[PDB]
């Protein structure tokens, strides 16, 4: 397992335009267009990602560049942040795959109100921190990932995902 492969079991692989857990345009591997509700905006969206018009239409390749600018984004992000970087940076590698999962997601705005599971964390109390992770509005929208997200974080095993 590594974090290409396990966000690929988490957001799946669709080739033409769909809405995702929250009724947002998306395509490919969890690649979110836009939060608006119009699909024409979405269509220029990928057009714009993509470099040619689409027609709501992408191919696996493509699907799959946006997958790596998206995670390697999400990372480069994370890294950005001074209140998110300071525990990313203590966590072990399997770990960090959790936290890449989790901003991908729900994005930066979206970890924002992780502040006391994120202390839990980087003072390694891994039982506590999972167990304030689920007290969340993302565990139960996505209760399914959230909890194979929060298992990782609190073994540093890939045991949710086999």
Same mark, same amino acid.
């Given at each position: 397992?590594?974090?290409? @492969?396990?966000?690929?079991? /988490?957001?799946?692989?669709?080739?033409?335009?769909?809405? /995702?857990?929250?009724?947002? %345009?998306?395509?490919?591997?969890?690649?979110?267009?836009?939060?608006?509700?119009?699909?024409?905006?979405?269509?220029?969206?990928?057009?714009?990602?993509?470099? +040619?018009?689409?027609?709501?239409?992408?191919?696996? /390749?493509?699907? @799959?560049?946006?997958?790596?600018?998206?995670? /390697?984004?999400?990372?480069?992000?994370?890294?950005?942040?001074?209140?998110?970087?300071?525990? %990313?940076?203590?966590?072990?590698?399997?770990?960090?795959?959790?936290?890449?999962? $989790?901003?991908? $997601?729900?994005?930066?705005?979206?970890?924002?109100?992780?502040?006391?599971?994120? +202390?839990?964390? $980087?003072?390694?109390?891994?039982? @506590?921190?999972?167990?304030?992770?689920?007290?969340?509005?993302?565990?139960?929208?996505?209760?399914?990932?959230?909890?194979?997200?929060?298992?990782?974080?609190?073994?540093?095993?890939?045991?949710? %995902?086999?």
């Amino acid at each position: 397992m590594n974090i290409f @492969e396990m966000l690929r079991i /988490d957001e799946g692989l669709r080739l033409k335009i769909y809405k /995702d857990t929250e009724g947002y %345009y998306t395509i490919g591997i969890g690649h979110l267009l836009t939060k608006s509700p119009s699909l024409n905006a979405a269509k220029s969206e990928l057009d714009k990602a993509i470099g +040619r018009n689409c027609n709501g239409v992408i191919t696996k /390749d493509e699907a @799959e560049k946006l997958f790596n600018q998206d995670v /390697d984004a999400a990372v480069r992000g994370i890294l950005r942040n001074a209140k998110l970087k300071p525990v %990313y940076d203590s966590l072990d590698a399997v770990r960090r795959c959790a936290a890449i999962n $989790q901003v991908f $997601q729900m994005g930066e705005t979206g970890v924002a109100g992780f502040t006391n599971s994120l +202390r839990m964390l $980087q003072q390694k109390r891994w039982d @506590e921190a999972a167990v304030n992770l689920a007290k969340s509005r993302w565990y139960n929208q996505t209760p399914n990932r959230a909890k194979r997200v929060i298992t990782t974080f609190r073994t540093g095993t890939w045991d949710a %995902y086999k």
